[PDB]
Ligand binder design. Structure first.
Ligand SMILES: Cc1cn([C@H]2C[C@H](O)[C@@H](COP(=O)(O)O)O2)c(=O)[nH]c1=O
Length: 239
């Protein structure tokens, strides 16, 4: 595939979003749930890619969960409990903007999880996801990669953006210094939890338009593959 100008990007995006709406109706009709994980550094473009992914999908059929730090009430349970509570029904879509993989990313880097906790978490997470995918759930995980210089450009845009500058803090700037550790943790995560039933898709995120298109294409492709594995064929169930 090639990069496209804005008009052709818009047309390709519109077709892919129609196909995503159709795929949602297909998964609902066949009562197969869909779980999408998004991870990546601050300003990697997770939020915008999610917005394009579900923009034309029926709002009754999905929930986007913006995941932040566990609250004190959530820490009274196992770290996966707050995520168990958010799982979609069969036939519904759940999007996790950050996810249980925080156990092996920010919580590992910041020392919130002990060494034993994050060390054993890879197989705990594999086993959890396998429970779901052996039943009636499809899981895809996306890592949006962004360069340090592109992230810096986006931080400066945010600090000049009246809708976003209130949220950018000195702590975020300082956390940019921890990026090497995050990259190492993400690479170990990829090595240990990239599974056939629950793949990691690495998304080239420096160009937002390409990232949005790729997220849509990869979601649709894995839905079609998993449909085939289940003896079903994705067709147009809209018209
Ligand atoms: C998303 C997330 C953040 N955190 C921590 C990191 C920071 O100390 C704090 C706020 O992070 P945030 O500003 O990126 O949401 O919460 C966790 O411990 N676990 C998580 O899953």
């Amino acid at each position: 595939s090639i990069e496209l100008d804005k008009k052709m990007y818009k047309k390709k995006l519109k077709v892919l979003q129609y196909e995503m709406l159709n795929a949602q109706q297909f998964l609902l009709k066949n009562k197969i749930g869909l779980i999408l994980v998004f991870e990546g550094m601050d300003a990697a473009g997770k939020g915008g890619a999610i917005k394009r992914l579900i923009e034309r999908v029926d709002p009754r059929g999905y929930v986007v969960h913006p995941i932040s730090a566990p609250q004190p009430h959530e820490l009274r349970y196992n770290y996966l409990q707050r995520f168990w509570r958010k799982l979609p029904q069969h036939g519904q879509i759940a999007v996790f903007d950050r996810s249980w993989y925080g156990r092996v990313l920010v919580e590992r880097i910041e020392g919130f999880a002990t060494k034993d906790e994050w060390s054993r978490a890879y197989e705990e997470i594999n086993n959890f996801e396998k429970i779901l995918t052996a039943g009636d759930y499809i899981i895809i995980k996306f890592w949006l990669h962004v360069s340090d210089e592109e992230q810096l450009k986006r931080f400066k845009e945010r600090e000049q953006n009246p809708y976003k500058s209130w949220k950018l803090t000195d702590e975020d700037w300082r956390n940019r210094e921890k990026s090497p550790q995050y990259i190492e943790a993400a690479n170990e995560m990829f090595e240990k939890t990239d599974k056939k039933n629950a793949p990691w898709v690495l998304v080239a995120g420096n160009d937002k338009k390409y990232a949005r298109v790729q997220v849509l294409q990869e979601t649709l492709a894995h839905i079609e593959r998993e449909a085939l594995k289940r003896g079903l064929h994705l067709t147009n169930v809209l018209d």
